[PDB]
């Protein structure tokens, strides 16, 4: 006869920080063109292997937001519905793919 | 994955930032162990303990000058000395 609410930071929550724990099936966005200082001075950094802050908070700088974390939960075993969208411009013959050379006699 | 992050353990107490203290959250066997073998193989530095400020009835939150300068009342400068008299003021509830 009493309205006991569900846990805000419950078994299905996504707790980020002192803000409200977002509930289940949130989304995380990965982009290689973040405005940050992470991969700028990284030596062997390209669009294949890059570092990105998932934290796209409009207030915190991306450099200073990559030091935070996402706590999905510890009471549940989670799983992410990964979807990838890559763009490529490789040529036919290239030294990377070992296709521009051949040996003759 | 640990059985402690799963529960409602306060974050400051869990990381011993505002926790009870190494004398009282370690198992009573471990304090004896680290004390006994404390002359050759110390473990005391591996268990953190935080000293915490009193934060009550120790400091006024009132706007109170931390450093007061008192101008002289009269000077009476002379050839061999330089007199100054002040009016040092210690308000009620103040201590100098």
């Amino acid at each position: 006869l009493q309205r006991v609410m569900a846990p805000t930071g419950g078994r299905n929550s996504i707790k980020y920080r002192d803000y409200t724990p977002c509930r289940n099936t949130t989304k995380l966005f990965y982009v290689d063109n973040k405005a940050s200082d992470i991969d700028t001075y990284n030596k062997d950094a390209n669009h294949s292997n890059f570092r990105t802050t998932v934290i796209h908070n409009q207030d915190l700088d991306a450099d200073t937001a990559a030091t935070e974390s996402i706590q999905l939960d510890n009471r549940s075993c989670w799983g992410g519905d990964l979807k990838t969208a890559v763009r490529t411009n490789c040529p036919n013959v290239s030294s990377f793919f070992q296709s521009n050379s051949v040996r003759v006699r | 994955l640990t059985p402690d992050l799963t529960t409602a353990t306060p974050r400051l107490q869990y990381f011993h930032i505002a926790g009870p203290g190494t004398r009282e959250y370690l198992s009573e066997d471990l304090q004896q162990f680290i004390s006994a073998t404390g002359s050759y193989f110390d473990l005391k530095n591996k268990f953190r303990q935080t000293v915490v400020a009193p934060t009550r009835n120790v400091t006024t939150e009132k706007a109170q000058r931390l450093q007061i300068r008192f101008y002289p009342i009269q000077t009476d400068d002379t050839s061999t000395g330089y007199r100054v008299r002040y009016n040092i003021n210690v308000g009620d509830g103040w201590v100098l």
């Binding site: 920080r17 002192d18 200082d37 992470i38 700028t40 001075y41 990284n42 030596k43 062997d44 908070n57 207030d59 915190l60 200073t64 | 640990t2 059985p3 402690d4 400051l12 990381f15 011993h16 930032i17 505002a18 959250y25 370690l26 198992s27 066997d29 471990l30 162990f33 591996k46 268990f47 953190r48």
Partner: protein, 99 residues
């Protein structure tokens, strides 16, 4: 083996802190500039110890978290890395404004 058992109890596990105990941030001050504003978003400040600050030459300081800083063409003493602070002076004042 006794020590291994009694260290695997969840109540008594190793806890470590960084002696610096400080989040490190570098704010660029151009050559002729004589002022600096440092604004940051809202933060909980749940256990702040205070503030520590000096100024260090940009040419004498590497980029934080950089595999290879190409612009770092200086091989003296990095005041950021060691304790070689020498520009604690040249600080006229400061104002801290939580709100």
């Amino acid at each position: 083996n006794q020590l291994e058992l009694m260290l695997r109890n969840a109540t008594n596990d190793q806890t470590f802190v960084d002696y610096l105990g400080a989040k490190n941030a570098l704010y660029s001050v151009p050559a002729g500039s004589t002022a600096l504003t440092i604004n940051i978003p809202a933060r909980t400040w749940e256990g702040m110890r205070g503030w520590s600050f000096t100024r260090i030459k940009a040419a004498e300081t590497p980029q934080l978290g950089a595999q290879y800083d190409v612009n770092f063409k200086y091989s003296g003493s990095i005041a950021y890395s060691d304790g070689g602070f020498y520009l604690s002076h040249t600080f006229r004042n400061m104002s801290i404004l939580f709100d």
